[PDB]
Write a structure and sequence with these properties.
This is part of a larger assembly, with chains A, B and C.
Chain A (H helix, E strand, L loop, with lengths): L7 E5 L4 E4 L19 E4 L6 E4 L4 E3 L11 E3 L6 E4 L7 E6 L3 E6 L10 E3 L7 E3 L5 E4 L7 E4 L16 E6 L5 E6 L4 E6 L10 E7 L6 E6 L5 E6 L3 E6 L5 E6 L17 E2 L5 E5 L5 E5 L5 E5 L6 E4 L6
Antiparallel strand pairs in A: 1-2, 1-26, 3-4, 4-5, 5-6, 7-8, 8-9, 9-10, 11-12, 12-13, 14-15, 15-16, 16-17, 18-19, 19-20, 20-21, 22-23, 23-24, 24-25
Chain B lengths: L5 H4 L1 H19 L13 H5 L1
Chain C lengths: L9 H15 L4 H27 L2 H28 L4 H14 L3 H13 L9 H6 L6 H16 L6 H8 L4 H17 L2 H17 L2 H19 L2 H15 L6 H26 L3 H21 L5 E3 H4 L1 H5 L20 E4 L2 E3 L11 E4 L4 E7 L5 H19 L1 H6 L8 E3 L5 E4 L4 E3 H11 L6 H9 L8 H13 L5 H9 L3 H25 L9 E4 L5 E3 L8 H4 L13 H6 L8 H15 L1 H13 L4 H7 L3 H17 L11 H13 L1 H6 L9
Antiparallel strand pairs in C: 1-3, 2-4, 4-5, 5-7, 6-7, 8-9, 9-10
């Protein structure tokens, strides 16, 4: 799990976090997570310990040692933790909850209490750390994206569309484009002005992609920054090319038969180390390692009793 | 039943109450005797 | 006004106009009503501009002359517009009360009111007897003296309209209310005397019936256990229990109270000895003996309470059994036009309903010969319901006047509500009704369907449903809705109906009545509409709403399980309607109701403002908060915005079709429905 270069954790409503192997597709070890589900996993850049954000506790399990109890159980929060970020230095950790109060947690510090807080109006649905490690993008249920600066605290609130919950938002590693997604199924792309010291961070609206008919759930650029995977409740994980914003490949898990209601929502999109493959979790209890160019399920992972809401993927050498 | 309306008191209490009153009534005539009620008894219960 | 607005320059102009109109047509109702309401708005505009400017010496003295310049015209005008309307004066009469209560302590406003009260007919005031008695103890002397004198003359003609609310005031806890009520009763006695004695007894006996000693001890020990074991509030625990000891210190007045003091009373008095030893010693071993005795009787009571299925008058209150051919009339039946349907006799048995609150089922025989069934609720304040029924009366009047509504036979089904104390009161039992939950339960037991099937499917798919995120909840909810055929109510409405011809009429009535109460409930703010709180008439098919405990978006305000649904428009109700959907009868009916209410916004606003501002009902708003005046102003503003149609966005006014469409989407939205507490049953 830890000693293996690739990691692929998985977790959902069954109170487990199963660490698979990409080359085989065999469950190496499970880990218990009582009292709640897991809403979002996250491997640390150092790769020393995974994270598991749940209900009123951000837990962080060990990746190297096997079968251990949670190393950290950061309590003292409420109404779930929607997401978790991680600072590339490995000191700071970000979260977002439904209490309308973003936070930052010092792993190095022994203090249980958090460090800083950025309260907002509506519940925070998603966090995303900007690769420069200076700006923290923060979506919410009212529609308001924010950019809480990590040095000046100057939040530049911005609402692409009034009264639509923005469910996820990601920014590519090259800081070129930033994508956002809402429950209507649009994909608002924003061109990042090149400011670091100035921190202007001006968001220039490029294209409203009519991505899906029904609720969209997660978007994420590739490390190449050529592709933009966009998951939704229509059981299709579309992949949009960054240059033309066109549908290069449409990965669907539909029945192929009109008599099949609520097969399962698709909310997984993690690119491979080189953007050749793409992992994808679905509510049919099955992870799926897709192929980008062809669009074929190479391997299927099974054994989860309940739905699968999270993924983790780490090819860091 | 034993000068007690059973449906007024509800089923279970009424059955206990009638047994108690019936004991008192008999205790007017024979006050020095061991009374032992059986209320909707089984066969073993009657045997013992 | 529509072009310019309300400001310093328009008011002198629009008054010049309405004055001319009044001159050219003296008799014309609308010319006086518009002049009066305009003056009244010129009052409240300059009052709120004083608080906006002066609050935020000479200016208030100028304001005295300024408002009194507009207050005396308003009063004289409303009194003339009351006589002319002769049957549609509700709005005008309430506006008179608001003016009287606020400014009537002034000599000049008092004079105008005195001349007016003489001129106006005494039948008009029967509409607003609740609002008058609410201010029975107004600190201002010149106001309160004229209230008494008016009530006196309401006593001398139509005393049946006064005895019930007066008897409730006469036994109020606060000293000034009861004193005023008794002083008025002293004057009422000379005219009749028999009425005062009868109503005082009947009400005392009904209260005794409404809450028995063992029921009071049960609720008291529950509260005292939560204070002691939960909060560790020992002095507050004695405050809960010491009234119950003083309650029994009257003694056994009925056979039920005798048998209570026999069985428990000895232990309670012994537990009081340990309590009184603790008061002068302060020992844990002393007070634990009292809680042992308290939990002994509490467990015995809890065992008894299921067995109390019925109460006989011979035991519980023999006074009421003796009562024959009372002149005191049946509650909420008195009409000045109809002949008084006085109480013939009370039935001997009381079918106690097995619920959380354990209501009784009182039934009275009328002198006309018809039986009148009631529901005797205990520890549930019914003054809200009384005020809400006054609102429904007004709305029914408005729908009767509109021809479109009249042609569609639109109306709200309402029932009698008669308070007896701050806790208890009588509710009129609506016959041929049963709760929606009961109907669905009985259909699903017939068809062998699991009652909690949708909930079980959800917990199977995701056992952490309560703790799931919003998107997760929406998925689970939708998966349940797709995997359950939601046709139980439509199907059972068909099967129940004897013939198709009747079924169609029942379904038309059902759809229209539902739409009417959806819009009215939205404006009023009525939340907490789970299927136990709405009932269906098994003959007419009309829907009935009950237990309006939550109003003015209290459900949205509360942190725990907040409800984001304006009115109940669930999938099962939609299926019960026409196959096409809400687009047909439901939408068209909603448009008509909304248009009429918007047209008559002034009348609706006047009624709403009076009861909200009432000090007695201020408690509910204060509890919702976390001063009192600021909270009330915000609530009124929200209601006004809904009638205008600016509720969704203040900047842009919305037309009636647009507003209705947005409301329907919000009510039926999956995201909003999922958040709702599971007891609300968003799946049915």
């Amino acid at each position: 799990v830890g000693s293996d270069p690739v990691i692929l954790a998985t977790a959902g409503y069954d109170h487990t976090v199963r660490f698979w192997q990409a080359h085989s597709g065999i469950c190496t070890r499970t880990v218990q997570h009582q009292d709640s589900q897991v809403n979002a996993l996250e491997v640390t850049p150092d790769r020393s310990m995974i994270a598991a954000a749940g209900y009123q506790h951000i837990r962080m399990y060990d990746l190297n040692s096997n079968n251990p109890n949670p190393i950290i159980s950061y309590d003292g929060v409420n109404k779930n933790i929607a997401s978790v970020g991680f600072h590339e230095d490995g000191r700071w950790m970000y979260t977002g909850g439904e209490d309308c109060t973003a936070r930052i947690w010092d792993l190095r510090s022994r203090n249980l209490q958090c460090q800083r807080i950025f309260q907002v109006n509506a519940p925070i649905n998603c966090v995303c750390l900007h690769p420069n490690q200076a700006e923290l993008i923060v979506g919410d249920q009212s529609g308001a994206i924010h950019i809480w600066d990590l040095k000046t605290d100057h939040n530049e609130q911005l609402i692409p569309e009034p009264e639509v919950s923005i469910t996820s938002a990601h920014i590519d590693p090259d800081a070129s484009y930033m994508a956002a997604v809402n429950s209507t199924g649009n994909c608002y792309v924003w061109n990042l002005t090149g400011g670091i010291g100035d921190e202007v961070t001006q968001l220039i609206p490029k294209t409203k992609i009519p991505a899906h008919t029904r609720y969209a759930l997660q978007c994420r650029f590739s490390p190449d920054s050529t592709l933009l995977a966009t998951c939704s409740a229509d059981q299709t994980c579309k992949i949009w090319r960054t240059s033309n914003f066109s549908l290069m490949t449409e990965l669907s898990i539909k029945s192929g038969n009109p008599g099949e209601s609520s097969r399962g929502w698709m909310w997984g999109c993690a690119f491979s180390g080189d953007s050749q493959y793409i992992v994808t979790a679905s509510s049919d209890n099955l992870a799926r390692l897709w192929c980008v160019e062809t669009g074929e399920i190479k391997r299927e992972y099974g054994g989860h009793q309940k739905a699968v809401v999270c993924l983790a993927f780490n090819d860091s050498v | 039943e034993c000068w007690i309306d059973p449906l007024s008191m509800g089923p279970q209490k009424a059955l206990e109450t009638i047994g108690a009153n019936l004991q008192k009534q008999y205790e007017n005539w024979q006050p020095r005797a061991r009374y032992k009620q059986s209320l909707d008894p089984t066969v073993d219960e009657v045997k013992k | 006004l529509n072009l310019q607005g309300i400001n310093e320059s328009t008011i002198p102009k629009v008054l010049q106009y309405y004055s001319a109109a009044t001159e050219h047509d003296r008799s014309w109702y609308k010319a006086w009503h518009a002049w009066a309401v305009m003056n009244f708005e010129a009052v409240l505009h300059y009052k709120h501009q004083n608080q906006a400017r002066d609050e935020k010496k000479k200016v208030t003295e100028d304001l005295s002359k300024t408002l009194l310049m507009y207050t005396v015209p308003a009063v004289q005008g409303f009194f003339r517009s009351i006589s002319l309307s002769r049957g549609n004066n509700l709005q005008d009469t309430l506006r008179v009360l608001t003016l009287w209560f606020d400014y009537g302590h002034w000599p000049d406003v008092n004079e105008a009111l005195v001349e007016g009260v003489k001129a106006i007919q005494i039948d008009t005031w029967l509409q607003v007897i609740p609002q008058l008695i609410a201010r029975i103890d107004t600190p201002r002397p010149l106001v309160g003296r004229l209230i008494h004198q008016l009530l006196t003359d309401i006593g001398r003609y139509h005393p049946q309209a006064l005895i019930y609310p007066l008897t409730v005031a006469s036994k109020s806890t606060t000293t000034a209310r009861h004193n005023a009520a008794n002083k008025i009763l002293k004057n009422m006695c000379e005219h009749s005397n028999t009425l005062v004695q009868q109503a005082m007894m009947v009400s005392e006996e009904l209260i005794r019936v409404a809450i028995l000693w063992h029921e009071m001890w049960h609720e008291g020990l529950e509260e005292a256990s939560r204070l002691y074991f939960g909060e560790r509030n020992v002095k507050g625990m004695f405050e809960v229990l010491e009234p119950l000891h003083a309650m029994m210190e009257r003694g056994p007045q009925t056979l039920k109270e005798t048998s209570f003091n026999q069985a428990y009373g000895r232990d309670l008095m012994e537990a009081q000895e340990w309590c009184r030893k603790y008061m002068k010693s302060g020992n844990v071993k002393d007070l634990t003996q009292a809680w042992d005795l308290y939990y002994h009787v509490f467990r015995r009571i809890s065992k008894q309470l299921p067995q109390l299925t019925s109460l006989e008058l011979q035991y519980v209150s023999p006074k009421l059994l003796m009562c024959r051919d009372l002149e005191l009339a049946v509650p909420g039946t008195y009409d000045p036009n109809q002949p008084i349907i006085r109480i013939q006799s009370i039935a001997p048995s009381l079918q106690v309903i097995t619920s959380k609150q354990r209501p009784r089922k009182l039934t009275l025989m009328g002198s006309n010969g018809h039986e009148f069934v009631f529901l005797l609720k205990g520890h549930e304040d019914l003054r809200q319901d009384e005020r809400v029924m006054q609102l429904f009366g007004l709305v029914n009047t408005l729908l009767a006047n509109d021809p479109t509504s009249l042609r569609k036979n639109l109306s709200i089904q309402r029932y009698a509500v008669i308070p007896l104390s701050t806790n208890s009161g009588l509710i009129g039992w609506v016959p041929h009704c049963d709760t929606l939950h009961a109907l669905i339960r009985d259909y699903r037991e017939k068809k062998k369907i699991l009652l909690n099937i949708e909930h079980r499917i959800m917990l199977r798919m995701a056992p952490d449903y309560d703790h799931l995120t919003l998107m997760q909840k929406v998925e689970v909810f939708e998966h349940a809705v797709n995997n359950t055929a939601g046709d139980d109510l439509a199907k059972l409405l068909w099967l129940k109906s004897p013939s198709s011809e009747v079924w169609f009429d029942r379904r038309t009535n059902y759809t229209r009545s539902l739409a009417v109460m959806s819009m009215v409930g939205y404006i009023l703010g009525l939340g907490d509409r789970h299927p136990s709180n709405l009932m269906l008439d098994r003959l007419s098919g009309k829907i009935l709403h009950i237990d309006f405990g939550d109003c003015f978006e209290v459900a949205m305000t509360r942190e725990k399980f907040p409800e984001k649904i304006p009115f109940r428009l669930t999938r099962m109700l939609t299926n019960a309607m026409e196959v096409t959907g809400l687009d047909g009868n439901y939408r068209i009916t909603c448009h008509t109701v909304m248009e009429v209410l918007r047209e008559h916004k002034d009348s609706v606003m006047a009624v709403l403002e009076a009861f909200v501002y009432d000090p007695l009902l201020n408690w509910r708003l204060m509890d919702t908060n976390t001063a009192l005046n600021k909270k009330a102003i915000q609530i009124i503003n929200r209601v006004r915005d809904k009638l205008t149609g600016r509720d969704f966005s203040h900047d842009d006014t919305l037309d009636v079709p647009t507003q209705v469409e947005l409301l329907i989407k919000q009510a039926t939205s999956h995201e909003n429905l999922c958040q709702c507490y599971i007891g609300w049953c968003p799946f049915w």
